[PDB]
Amino acid sequence: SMQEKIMRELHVKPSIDPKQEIEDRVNFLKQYVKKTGAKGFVLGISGGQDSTLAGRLAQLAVESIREEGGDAQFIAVRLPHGTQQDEDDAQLALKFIKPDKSWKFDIKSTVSAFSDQYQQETGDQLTDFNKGNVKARTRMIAQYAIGGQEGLLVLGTDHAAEAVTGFFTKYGDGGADLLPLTGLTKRQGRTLLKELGAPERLYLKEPTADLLDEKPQQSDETELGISYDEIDDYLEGKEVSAKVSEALEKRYSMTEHKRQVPASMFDDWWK
């Protein structure tokens, strides 16, 4: 069964124990830190559900490590491109996460320098969509710069509901060192945030990439054409309409390249 295969590959559990999931994921963060001797984590905080959840998990892991006598820190970073329309949500997220450190890095001048150079070098102007991907990749650079400067690992917010659609920028937000949210569907992530006591605003808002200058705050569902609820039912193994299966299985096959290391002639997944 395709549904069954996609579920196993994305590590989705049809039924979770919220409390245990948090314990498991915080323990994963701690184990990884100890194994690598890293000093902690850095994660861009957007004000959206995913980074809010990953952020809180990283803070809990770091506090748990210190409590045991270890040394670890967590730097949450605001990465606006100029003014962020929902900056207030990002600030709310920070108030909830309570990170050790809250930094900010405005990516606008870097993206502008890039775009200008692009037009200068090719005579062409970057399309809104392509510039959006430059923004996502510039955020990865900003996080790795901070991680490299301070000796921290970069957390990624990828989870099953976005992995299934390849709904992330290759080497942009998809570029991270570890993924604490792997296998969680969108509603399961929301369940974890409720368990953690997060303000409802953070999980009630519409998921957005917010990468376009022409259409800022464009909802994921708008670009995708499927709702997160249909995506989650599928991932959780619920019998869904053939229209959902067909759309998702098609999207999954086309984005396999985003879930694998660069392709070589010795790889079969692409044939």
Added chain:
Amino acid sequence: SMQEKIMRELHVKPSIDPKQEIEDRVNFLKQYVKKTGAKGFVLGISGGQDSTLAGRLAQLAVESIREEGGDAQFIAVRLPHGEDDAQLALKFIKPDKSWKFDIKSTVSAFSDQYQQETGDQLTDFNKGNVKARTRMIAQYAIGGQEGLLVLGTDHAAEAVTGFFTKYGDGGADLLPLTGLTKRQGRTLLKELGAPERLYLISYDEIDDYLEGKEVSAKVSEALEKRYSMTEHKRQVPASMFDDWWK
């Protein structure tokens, strides 16, 4: 045996037929592009051995596809930070298109912004990684604008040591040089008829290790340690369901 395990995982062959290797690798590029419907490839050309080799294979692949009546193009891009060898490489590769994207203004802006926001200046090392990642962005910007796949120049000798920037020069779509040792790549370049100026622990020691030849315990222990330490660069981001990191 660690040497044997590594050799198997990196797909290195003890000996190669240079003519056949070129054919197989050109075929891989043609096959991948055809499977995907992409319009061609983009590759940053530095004047170095690896990109010169990857570039020539890409140009041959694109010419092969057009020969079969298809549509494919190769854009070689110079990515200076603000050139003689790169020019020699271009003369040898003869790409359909030869572009340039100076990354200095982007890196400077990032660098100034980092100092403003943090109060810290980016150290040389970290600034080097920013340059590698900016090159990745430029290649993908071009690829995204033109509908091309980004080629990576990673090979076995570079993969064992993790000597590349994660999401920088390591960020690519396909890897035509996978499994090749440094010396084997030199052999392919010679076979292709590249000028010597382009293809000319000990890097030759790394090659011996990868090809399954006997090396000192010092070489082995060194490489095997560096290999396990860089596993994270050869895998997708780690999750609790992954085992390789434990």
